[PDB]
Amino acid sequence: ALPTPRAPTGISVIVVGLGFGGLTAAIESHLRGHSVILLEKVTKVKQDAGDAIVIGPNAVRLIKSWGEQLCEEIEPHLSNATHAEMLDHHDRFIVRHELAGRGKGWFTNRGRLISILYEHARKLGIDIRLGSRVTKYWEEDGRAGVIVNDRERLAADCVICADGVHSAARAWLTGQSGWANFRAHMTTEQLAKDPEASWVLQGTREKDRVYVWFGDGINLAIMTMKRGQELAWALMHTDKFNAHESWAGGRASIDDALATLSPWPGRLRPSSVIRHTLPEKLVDHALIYRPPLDTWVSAGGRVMLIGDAAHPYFPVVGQGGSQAIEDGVVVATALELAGKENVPLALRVAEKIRYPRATVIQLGSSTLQEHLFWPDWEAVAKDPSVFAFPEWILGHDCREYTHQVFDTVVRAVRGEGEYIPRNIPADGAY
Numbered sequence: 001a002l003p004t005p006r007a008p009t010g011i012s013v014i015v016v017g018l019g020f021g022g023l024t025a026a027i028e029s030h031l032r033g034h035s036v037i038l039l040e041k042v043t044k045v046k047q048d049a050g051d052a053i054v055i056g057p058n059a060v061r062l063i064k065s066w067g068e069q070l071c072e073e074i075e076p077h078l079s080n081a082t083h084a085e086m087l088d089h090h091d092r093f094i095v096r097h098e099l100a101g102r103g104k105g106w107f108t109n110r111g112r113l114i115s116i117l118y119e120h121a122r123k124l125g126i127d128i129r130l131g132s133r134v135t136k137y138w139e140e141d142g143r144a145g146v147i148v149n150d151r152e153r154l155a156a157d158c159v160i161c162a163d164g165v166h167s168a169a170r171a172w173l174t175g176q177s178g179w180a181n182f183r184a185h186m187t188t189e190q191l192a193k194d195p196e197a198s199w200v201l202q203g204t205r206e207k208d209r210v211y212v213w214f215g216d217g218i219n220l221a222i223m224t225m226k227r228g229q230e231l232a233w234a235l236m237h238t239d240k241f242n243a244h245e246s247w248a249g250g251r252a253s254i255d256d257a258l259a260t261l262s263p264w265p266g267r268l269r270p271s272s273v274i275r276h277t278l279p280e281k282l283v284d285h286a287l288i289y290r291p292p293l294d295t296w297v298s299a300g301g302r303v304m305l306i307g308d309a310a311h312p313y314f315p316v317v318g319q320g321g322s323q324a325i326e327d328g329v330v331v332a333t334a335l336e337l338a339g340k341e342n343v344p345l346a347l348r349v350a351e352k353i354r355y356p357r358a359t360v361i362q363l364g365s366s367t368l369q370e371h372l373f374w375p376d377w378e379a380v381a382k383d384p385s386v387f388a389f390p391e392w393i394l395g396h397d398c399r400e401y402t403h404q405v406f407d408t409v410v411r412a413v414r415g416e417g418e419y420i421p422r423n424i425p426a427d428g429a430y
């Protein structure tokens, strides 16, 4: 049984992006009685066997309330990995630690989860328009909208922008890193013949294995999949040097990834593994980071940013997509409770509920990023608990929390009172 949406709220919503924030906002809004159209520029969900992601329990509980079929749909795509073996740049063992969530989260592939959420949204009857490039955001009194493919104008009660780190909505709302990440996937047939690399296949038939190396401004993670028949890895590094007046296209070579690891005294075993990567299965994406914004909401109050467009994280917290999902849920829940004649209030309300929680984690990823690239090996040796992968994040329910505080936040925005955020730790630090 697919959940039947609530009574029509009379609220039309334009959602930009088919990522985690956009699909979340669209599905939750539809089920809460809103009239949803989702606009995405790509023609199909991109499928990459190496794009592995961790969805935390705080987002899994939200996704589960959209249909029980999803748990049985993503199950064969969930990794059975339990621990990550941390090592230094000398290739010396630090510690094994559990992955976060105590097994209540989802360690799976991105495109296969997005495809399931895309199909579930279609079964619900949500108007999803692919191949629809959004630009030229605009806003008036009572309505806001976008231009699709520079030919079609759409207008609605509000526009929720989840167009990622490369957000044109952000630039329109505001008017205003040096790191990169190798990403790769491979089969292990050729690697199994190499005795300098075959070590990575140990114990893989029983359970997926994870190895991570930290040190000297470099991070490397290797993950086995499918009983050791496949693996994926990610290498965070300083961005490749390009000339002043240089070709504006992208590039990715395994030799640069290997050269990045050359200064490591323990380079042998990691390099012996990744050197079997085929060139067609390797990318090198620059990582975007921007400090917290002054606001996620436009002046008129009917255009709002969520997800990476609002709060891009350094990928060391495993909460980017989950926080985008929390964004989409609270926004949709707030619209339902404020009503047609208070759409700007709802988005002002969702902002002050979400901004502290996403900003603590945002700044927390910036602090943890320095510690994991240039660690104090004395403190690590004294207490290895620092390196290794919080109930106030994973045990939280943004939905019921939004219901608790809605009136309190409404009175806080209007000025009747104050709002004490309790979706973050007291004296909030990550």
Ligand SMILES: Cc1cc2nc3c(=O)[nH]c(=O)nc-3n(C[C@H](O)[C@H](O)[C@H](O)COP(=O)(O)OP(=O)(O)OC[C@H]3O[C@@H](n4cnc5c(N)ncnc54)[C@H](O)[C@@H]3O)c2cc1C
Residues within 6 Å of the ligand: 016, 017, 018, 019, 020, 021, 022, 039, 040, 041, 042, 052, 053, 054, 055, 056, 132, 133, 134, 135, 162, 163, 164, 165, 166, 168, 181, 234, 287, 306, 307, 308, 309, 315, 318, 319, 320, 321, 322, 323, 324
């Ligand atoms: C290396 C790395 C590892 C990560 N690991 C994790 C992890 O383990 N767990 C986790 O939770 N998060 C992780 N993240 C973060 C996670 O990838 C993002 O936070 C999440 O995708 C953000 O959701 P989103 O919906 O905002 O953005 P996106 O997923 O980026 O979605 C935006 C969508 O908008 C579309 N779009 C863009 N512009 C337009 C336009 N003009 N018109 C129409 N459509 C447009 C794009 O096609 C894209 O489909 C990681 C990030 C990185 C870089």
